[PDB]
Amino acid sequence: LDAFEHTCPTGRTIYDSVYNDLINYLASPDQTEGFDDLIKNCREQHEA
């Protein structure tokens, strides 16, 4: 999201978009499968 340097005021809906996947990663910090493509998808949605 580039949320730190840049102040894009759209993060609410994107967070709502990948909420459950991200919290599955968080509460289970063991698995790293498929995280990078989610990052790229979020970046694409954000720039669009």
CA distance 46 to 30: 27
- Residues with Cβ within 8 Å of 21's Cβ and at least 6 positions away in sequence, in order, are 38
Per the CB < 8 A criterion, the answer to whether 1 and 41 are in contact is no
What one-character DSSP code corresponds to residue 28? S
Radius of gyration, alpha carbons of the chain = 11
- Residues with Cβ within 8 Å of 17's Cβ and at least 6 positions away in sequence, in order, are 42, 45
CA distance 7 to 1: 9
Query: In the chain, which residues are followed by a C-to-N distance beyond 2.5 Å, i.e. a gap?
Result: none
- Header resolution in angstroms: 3.4
CA distance 48 to 33: 25
Q: Let me know how many helices (H) and strands (E) the chain has, helices first.
A: 3, 0
Tokens 């990052």 belong to 39
